[PDB]
Amino acid sequence: ATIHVDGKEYEVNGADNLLEACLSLGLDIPYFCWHPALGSVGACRQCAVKQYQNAEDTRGRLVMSCMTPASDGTFISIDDEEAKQFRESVVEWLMTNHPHDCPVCEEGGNCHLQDMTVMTGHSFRRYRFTKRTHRNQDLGPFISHEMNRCIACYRCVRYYKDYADGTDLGVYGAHDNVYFGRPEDGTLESEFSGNLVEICPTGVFTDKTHSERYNRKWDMQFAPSICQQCSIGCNISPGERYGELRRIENRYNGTVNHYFLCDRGRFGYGYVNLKDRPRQPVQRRGDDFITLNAEQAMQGAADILRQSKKVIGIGSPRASVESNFALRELVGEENFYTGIAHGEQERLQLALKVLREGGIYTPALREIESYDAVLVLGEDVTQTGARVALAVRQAVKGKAREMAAAQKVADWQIAAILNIGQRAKHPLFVTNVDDTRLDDIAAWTYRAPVEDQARLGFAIAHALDNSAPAVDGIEPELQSKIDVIVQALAGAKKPLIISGTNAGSLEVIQAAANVAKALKGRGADVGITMIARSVNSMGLGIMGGGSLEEALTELETGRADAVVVLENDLHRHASAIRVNAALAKAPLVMVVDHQRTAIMENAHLVLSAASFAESDGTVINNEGRAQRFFQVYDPAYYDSKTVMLESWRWLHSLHSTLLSREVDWTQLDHVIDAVVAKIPELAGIKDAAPDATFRIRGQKLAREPHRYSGRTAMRANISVHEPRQPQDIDTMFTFSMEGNNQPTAHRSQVPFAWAPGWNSPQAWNKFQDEVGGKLRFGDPGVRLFETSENGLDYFTSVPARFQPQDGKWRIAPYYHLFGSDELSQRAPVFQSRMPQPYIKLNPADAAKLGVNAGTRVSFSYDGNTVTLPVEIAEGLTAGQVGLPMGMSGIAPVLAGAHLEDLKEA
Amino acid sequence: AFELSAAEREAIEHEMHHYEDPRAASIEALKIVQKQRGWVPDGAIHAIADVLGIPASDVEGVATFYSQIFRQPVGRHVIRYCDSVVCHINGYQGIQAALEKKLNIKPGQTTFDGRFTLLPTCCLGNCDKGPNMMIDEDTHAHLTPEAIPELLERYK
Amino acid sequence: ATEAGLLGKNIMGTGFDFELFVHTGAGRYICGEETALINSLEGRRANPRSKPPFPATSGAWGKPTCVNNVETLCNVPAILANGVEWYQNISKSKDAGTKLMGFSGRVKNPGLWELPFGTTAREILEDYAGGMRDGLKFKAWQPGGAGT
Ligand SMILES: Cc1cc2nc3c(=O)[nH]c(=O)nc-3n(C[C@H](O)[C@H](O)[C@H](O)COP(=O)(O)O)c2cc1C
Ligand code: SF4
Ligand code: SF4
């Protein structure tokens, strides 16, 4: 299409509206109610331009650019005097009731309303009457509410209800008394409620966790990082001030997470700021805990390791690829053990084999929204891979999108699309041990044990393809439900099969692979998604190694007398008594970690490792994409006694001091080169980000904005002499403002979005190739493996149906977005959001045991009689006890296990 | 707490039969609850939402959008005087002042005995016979300030 | 009409099924706007909708919908019963048929009369409304409601 803006010719997409087309061209049109991910509704009336009928037209008329298609031969003017006057008048009308709040408002300096007030040129107030006022609501521990600042742009309700499918936020009242919030005080129930603080263009919805230690956007030190709280790999911009992690902002990745995070990623960062974190190397000498610097810690550890007869290393899926590789190089490949249990390792390696050998394409997180039917087997996605659940909700809305496209409705006219679609949706079928949060939009939900969910998957695969193994013993009603799923999946152009390792069942993953293979054999464009457990579960699976049980066996038999545990608490993957006994038997325990864990009491040496905020590295997400995270700040800048290094730096220096008796702190690119030289399956992590020599016209990439303040005073109380700028030899970023963050700079790692005149998250428009698309020079992160040419065979190991044995209680896993992840559950703001510990019981089982809801019952696992209160689960099948995985005292390895003597305390 | 009565629930499902989407019975469900209890209390929002299968935020948005759905307690009789343009020409201000004097309450308020609540309302579609008022279900036209106390006695 | 077969199933034996409901409002002036009317009928807040699409293609619950005033639908049966030629020759004006017109507000006879299009406002004011009341002089008038 061809448009003429202010007498200048432009080539645009005709299927776009004029606002997103002009913003993609670099032109500035003020806007409030439009969002790239939410569509156009034409509410705020801010985006007025003057449209002319033809070239020889001087009158024109004011139109909404967001509601006007960018059709071929379209003549508009942005800088027309009447259009500018009307846009200024719209800002002025918004300003009549706006509170005098910018100094005490958390949005200030990051506020889209401030930016558009300045952009329209409105700075003189002639309104003299009263301003309307609203009372605020309590919205829970994450979101702070201030309705005075609302401009009634309806972005919050459109995102929360129409996009995120939330139910507890709405708009109330009428005329100028419209109110946006909950129907009563309470916590916002959506797992994606935290995106309101970026969706809202004003300071109505703000980050309460950031508000506690508030600082302005210009004062932040930003880095591009990867969220560490699950396996999805959403791109984040952590921002630090005064040595503490202050905020997690969304970093736009047009391939993975685009505009949105989940609440665990956004608000679960508080473990970085915990005061009990190790900051120096500490050696246990008898009952004394002496503090070492880096060099003598390396020398003492190297001497003791040299005296040892066999050193084993226990990695973790929390640690990066480089850290796990450095531990593997320190101890040797045959002495390296993954820190996860044997069953978890089997499930993770099966998921990896399905992903990189199954011949079925695995989609990125944005690509999930383009699928026409979804079958989720076993994986409680909202509690384990939440952003996948949000993308699945978008894929469900795809049917209304297609129906509206059949009626020649433009794809941005979202209200017309929703009106045409009504309650029609693409088919979604979820299976779990109980109800999920996707049940509101799912075409069907199967509440069954993991064996029965696997049998349902195998039956679906057999009915799709007769070469798949059959299932004997399916009831006719379950058969009818299976047939419903089969005709929904067979008639889909793009079916998607989602599973993962969190169900605790190998057979669930096998059944999902069988369904995907059966759909691939019929010629469908089938995709498969595997949800892993942790941020680098897939990287640890690719690297490989022995299980934690084998490492504990080596420690117990005395074959290994030295153990180096990297970033692993070891209690989530094995019983605490066995771990404690094996670690007490070992004459040397060294723990390299950034969190004070329970195994540090028996540790002979503790190395103060860096968390993700203080370290660089690579993590492989659930789709196999290698992504680099960069260090946010120097931990030694304020506290000069802090010796907190990257885990790979500690382990490389330990290996060098063990070999040549000399220290070697090395560089990140050297470790990455060693990884890609030694492990060819991880060769793609080299191209996840450019090396430390990368420059934009000779200059590095700035971590902090150009208006960063307090350089000669932030450390003045410690010393009036300003310290040296922290040097970054590892990456291409600099720990200063003296660098490049231009939106036109040829790079893919953007620490934060800022453009002149766009101080809010709307500056990501300037950083994109087209608005709502990808980053201008490509989204960061590369895929490790391509889709294989040939697939796997059908898995013939169809399990038998679940049978409740008397006196034995099968543990059904229950996951929680707030509580199941280890580091995020250590965050203090999550404790209020955390559910109270519980045990779920069937009504028949609770009546048989003579217990009601709330009564405290006790059970013994690995010789630990623990007591929990009972709540009644309607959807749980009898013979099962529902336990909250990943919580304190309940390890995630308990999923699929069995319970004895479960009786009332 | 709030519990929907059997008659209210049955009327709500009967209204749900009239449409292809049960959300379309939200206004009439709120009106049914208001007709039974004078107004719509806070628990009625959640009850109507549970019966209709729609979120409580949507029911509250509907209830607070429409002016004749009362989300605050009202008196036994709701006086609604027209304050629109033709009744302004015909002199609704004298009628309003007579109501002020007789009831001793401002518009939007309720009398101390809970007998009356005074409310302005938009044009009642009776402009040729103005000024107009609407007590609970009866519209009174050709109003004069002298006839207002006589009109208010027949609503006990 | 339902008891006499004018409404319901098989009206006049023609096989046409038509059910007529009465939806009572809850008091907002914006509900008369046709797309806001459709939103209110669906049980939502009565915000209007952007056009296009018009309700004829996707209106109530996404279906084809036609919204018409009471007086238009009341003009329909006389057109169908007496014919097009009678309706065109009601008056010699560009707007065909009769219209309910009136005058209100401190006139001698405020009311409503069915008049052909092209009737002057002076004819309605004096010959039908009786002019202004005694002691009052004409100052202004609004032709078609508060929004004119
Ligand atoms: C704010 C607003 C309120 C309206 N209220 C009414 C109304 O109460 N009754 C009505 O028939 N039309 C009303 N209309 C006009 C309708 O939008 C629509 O044109 C009409 O109801 C049906 O069209 P018709 O005149 O061809 O029958 C209103 C329009 C607006 C903008
Ligand atoms: S929302 Fe924006 S304009 Fe309003 S007080 Fe806050 S910073 Fe100022
Ligand atoms: S609360 Fe924020 S997002 Fe919602 S309408 Fe008001 S300004 Fe817009």
Ligand code: SF4
């Ligand atoms: S979905 Fe996972 S990776 Fe993404 S923000 Fe949430 S916890 Fe982080």
Ligand code: FES
């Ligand atoms: S952005 Fe177009 S009217 Fe709001």
Ligand code: FES
């Ligand atoms: S102006 Fe009062 S009834 Fe119409």
Ligand SMILES: [Ca+2]
């Ligand atoms: Ca570094």
